[PDB]
Each structure stands twice: as structure tokens, then as C-alpha cells.
Copies of this chain bind each other. A is one copy, B any other.
Amino acid sequence: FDYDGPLMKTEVPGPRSRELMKQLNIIQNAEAVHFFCNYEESRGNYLVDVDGNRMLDLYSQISSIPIGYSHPALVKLVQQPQNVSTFINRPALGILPPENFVEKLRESLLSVAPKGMSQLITMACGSCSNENAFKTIFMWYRSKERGESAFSKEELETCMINQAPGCPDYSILSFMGAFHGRTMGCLATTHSKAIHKIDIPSFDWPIAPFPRLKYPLEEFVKENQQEEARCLEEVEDLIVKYRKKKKTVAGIIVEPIQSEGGDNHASDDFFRKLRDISRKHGCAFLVDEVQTGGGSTGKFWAHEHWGLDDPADVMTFSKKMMTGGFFHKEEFRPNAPYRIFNTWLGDPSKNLLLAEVINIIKREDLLSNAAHAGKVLLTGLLDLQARYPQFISRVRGRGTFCSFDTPDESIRNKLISIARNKGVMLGGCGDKSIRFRPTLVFRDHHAHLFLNIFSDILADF
């Protein structure tokens, strides 16, 4: 189930990784590779590289490994002769689903449906989840504006040549700092880093400011309240402005916590008010839980913290859920087939794994565990913040979804590199932030393992 603690043999990346990285660099730009891994020996919270180093993984493959490496319940799943077909016979799910398709969804995604969302469509990643959510919303908004009336074949002629009115000028509203994926629709709503965006054609869609909170939160209540109201007002202005530009906002997309943009949090009150604005202006409210979903904030979906019976119209997911997809309200159900469609629509082998994952999360009480291990981790980070204010500021988090800021990008990268050499895998976000994305089997004792290591690092820094 897990190892005792990290065990380091070489610097990271070590010689075998550098050689493998050299080989990979022949066929593609491999500059992003951190090191090469031995997934066969990785277990629980621990990632093992090809040089025999064993690191406590607080990054979890960009927050996509739900219950650790080589989990024995998932090993057993694959060993079962009845499951071999799921792995070698991949169906075109939208036309030829396998027999157990509904029953496996009942054991997995449907058992954690968000409140008010009866509909579910599966997708293979977070980008095509969000893209097909955009299209679902565009179709819903046009269906609002046309009744009753069928497809005018002026629309049917124009749409084949990328022309109005068949191809409308609707917009999706998004937030500075957002990250929603990399295909060209998602990218327009992404506003994280210049390197993600530069040289790519885009859409003229409204971009709103995301609240920047001041820490400690308990000393800045009035100012954080004012900041959020400012952002809410600008959101509303943009909807009216782009309505007058004939670029009508059909939906609003937001992350419950902005990840790649620098772990930007906002109050539950902000999101409830934003959901209200979306309803008021007839915009679909699209909540992207690709990164916050799967339980690390202490609830299965992070938007559950908002306390709403009607939290959103559409909610997209991926990563920890193994498969992508989106839940939505019944009124967004497409009237006709083949409008939301592609070859694979996910992968039933991922659903097979996800049903066992969800069963482990529920039986091992891992939502409550994440709330607890996260409080322990955050308490420790606040302690380190008080002891090393020249290095650590803006400690923040919900559940294990935690982060802090360092002085600059150069310092962030040195600390990550040292921590890796001391047996801890960390990830970055934003300009200068260090983020924590532990798997759901991260325990309070793993928090202490990290904090002790980081204490000695900051002492010697």
C-alpha cells in the first residue's frame, strides 16, 4: 500500500534519466521532462525514478493520480480475466456501447453527480470536456433564441462555410488567471501564462478579473469583500458590453480555485453571487472541476463548499476521475444526436478503474481524510511562514489543495529542485508559487514528513 518514507540514491535527474532524456530529445522537444520513472516500483504516495530514487510525490502527475501508485485494488481489477476485453476492445461509445456501460456509470460517475445535474456525457480529457461544454451551451442559447422555430436553412447553408448566422458570434466569459485547456476553444478562455497563448489565433471574448485576496484573510475581511464586489461588477459590465457588441455571452466558465494561474482562491460568497449573475443574464454557469474535482478540497467536488442546491448548469471534470466528461442540467440535453459526438467519448477501461477508485474513496473515508491531512499540512506551512518570512508568503489552501508564494521564479525553482534532491516532489504554478497536489492517500504523517524536510531545507537555504 505504501513505503515508509523517501529514499534518495542520486541527484535528480540522475544519470539514467539524463540518458533517457537525451534519447527522447531526438524526436521531440523534451525540455519539460523532469525525470524518467519506474512506475512498476512506485507505490502509494511514492514515485520511483529510473535511478532508484524514491520520492514523496506531492504533485501526483499534475493532480491526476487519485489514490496513489499501483493501488492493490486496481492491480486486482486488471488481473481479472473478465476485464481483459475492456482493455483491448475499445468501442465507439456513442454508437456501440458495451453491455455493462450504464451499470458501470451507475457505480462511478452517476454516484457522485452534482446537485441538479441529471445528464452525463463522457469525454477523454479536460480540454474536449470543456470544448463540448462550450458547444452544449452554444446550442442551448440558440435554442432559447429560436423557440419553437426549426433550423432555418439559411443557417444550415451558412454554418457549413463558417459564416453567420449559422455560425453565431456568441462568446464565453472567462477570468484572468484561468486555465481551461489547450485546444483553440479552451485556449481562448485560458489566461494563465503567455507561453500558453503566444502566436495562437484566439476569440474576442470577455475576460474578467479574478479576485486577488489579501492574507491573513482574517485581517483583510473588508478589503477582500470589496475586491470581490469589484470583480463581480466588472463581470456584469462585460456581459452588457458584449451584448451590445452583438457578441452575446452564452456562458461563464470558472474554476472553484484557479490552479495554473497561481492557486487563486475566492470566497464561497463570491461564487454564489457569480452563479446568480450568470442566471440573471441568461448565461450558462460552467464550473471547471478538472483540477479541483476528485476530493482533495475535502468534498468530492470543490463547488460543494458553496452550499448551493443549484450550483451550476454544467460541470466538467477529468484527471483524478480517470475519464473526462461533463454533468449538466436536463435543459441542456441536446435535442438531436450527432451534435455532441466523437469517435471514443472517453474509454470504458477508465470507467472500470474509476468505479473501484470511488469505492475506495468512500469506504476509506478519503474526503474527510483530505480535509484533515490538509489542515495539518496548512498549519505546518503557516508555522514555516512565521519562521521564514523572507521566503514564504500568502500560505493558503483548502483541504490538501495548498500553496504559498516565494520571492521570485528563481527562488521557487531552486526550492523545488532541492526538495526533489531531498526526496519530495513538488510542483509550481504562477510566477513564483509552490503548489501541493497530493494523492488522496496522503495522510497527516506524510504532511509531517514533508514539513520536517522542508524545515531543514529552509534552515540551510
Enumerate chain A interface residues (CB-CB to B < 8 A): 20, 23-24, 26-29, 31-40, 42, 47, 50, 61-62, 64-65, 69-71, 74-75, 77-79, 81-82, 84-92, 94-99, 101-102, 105, 110, 118-121, 124-128, 131-132, 134-135, 138-139, 142-143, 151, 155-157, 159-163, 166-171, 176, 181-186, 188, 191, 193-205, 207, 318-319, 322, 333-344, 349, 353
Copies of this protein in the assembly total 2
B residues less than 8 Å from A142 (CB atoms): 199
B62 and A95 contact, CB distance less than 8 A = yes
B residues less than 8 Å from A88 (CB atoms): 70-71, 74-75, 77-78, 353
**A146: nearest residue on chain B (CB-CB)?**
B199
Question: Are A200 and B99 also in contact (CB < 8 A) when A87-B78, A89-B39 are?
Answer: no
**A96: nearest residue on chain B (CB-CB)?**
B37
A182 and B341 contact, CB distance less than 8 A = yes
B residues less than 8 Å from A340 (CB atoms): 29
A197 and B167 contact, CB distance less than 8 A = yes
A343 and B62 contact, CB distance less than 8 A = yes
List 8 A-B pairs, Cβ < 8 Å: A37-B98, A61-B92, A64-B344, A79-B84, A87-B349, A151-B198, A168-B201, A193-B338
B residues less than 8 Å from A335 (CB atoms): 29
Q: How far is the CA of A96 from the CA of B353 in the complex (A)?
A: 21
Give me 16 other A-B pairs in contact (C-beta within 8 A), A27-B110, A32-B94, A162-B197 excluded: A20-B97, A27-B120, A28-B119, A29-B337, A31-B336, A36-B98, A36-B99, A37-B99, A38-B98, A139-B199, A151-B194, A159-B199, A163-B204, A166-B194, A167-B197, A196-B339
Which 7 pairs between the two chains have the least Cβ-Cβ distance?
A: A184-B185, A162-B202, A31-B337, A32-B337, A167-B202, A61-B92, A39-B89
A184, A349, A353: residue with the most chain B Cβ atoms closer than 10 Å: A184
Task: Report which of B91, B105, B143, B197 forms a contact with A160, defined as CB distance below 8 A.
Answer: B197
Task: Report which of B36, B183, B193 forms a contact with A127, defined as CB distance below 8 A.
Answer: B183
B residues less than 8 Å from A39 (CB atoms): 85-86, 89, 91, 98-99
Q: How far is the CA of A162 from the CA of B151 in the complex (A)?
A: 31
B residues less than 8 Å from A169 (CB atoms): 201
B residues less than 8 Å from A167 (CB atoms): 197-202
B102 and A89 contact, CB distance less than 8 A = no
B residues less than 8 Å from A125 (CB atoms): 124-125, 128, 342-344
Q: How far is the CA of A157 from the CA of B171 in the complex (A)?
A: 21
Question: Are A195 and B75 also in contact (CB < 8 A) when A27-B118, A50-B99, A184-B185 are?
Answer: no
A258 CB, nearest partner CB in chain B, Å: 14
A128 CB, nearest partner CB in chain B, Å: 6
B37 and A91 contact, CB distance less than 8 A = yes
Task: Report which of B47, B176, B205, B342 forms a contact with A182, defined as CB distance below 8 A.
Answer: B342
B residues less than 8 Å from A20 (CB atoms): 97, 99, 101-102
Q: How far is the CA of A77 from the CA of B89 in the complex (A)?
A: 13
Q: How far is the CA of A450 from the CA of B166 in the complex (A)?
A: 40
B residues less than 8 Å from A343 (CB atoms): 61-62, 64, 125-126, 318-319
A145 CB, nearest partner CB in chain B, Å: 10
B337 and A89 contact, CB distance less than 8 A = no
Question: Are A338 and B202 also in contact (CB < 8 A) when A37-B91, A70-B85, A119-B28 are?
Answer: no
A9 CB, nearest partner CB in chain B, Å: 15
A34 and B95 contact, CB distance less than 8 A = yes
A36 and B97 contact, CB distance less than 8 A = yes
Q: How far is the CA of A24 from the CA of B119 in the complex (A)?
A: 10
B residues less than 8 Å from A91 (CB atoms): 37, 39, 61
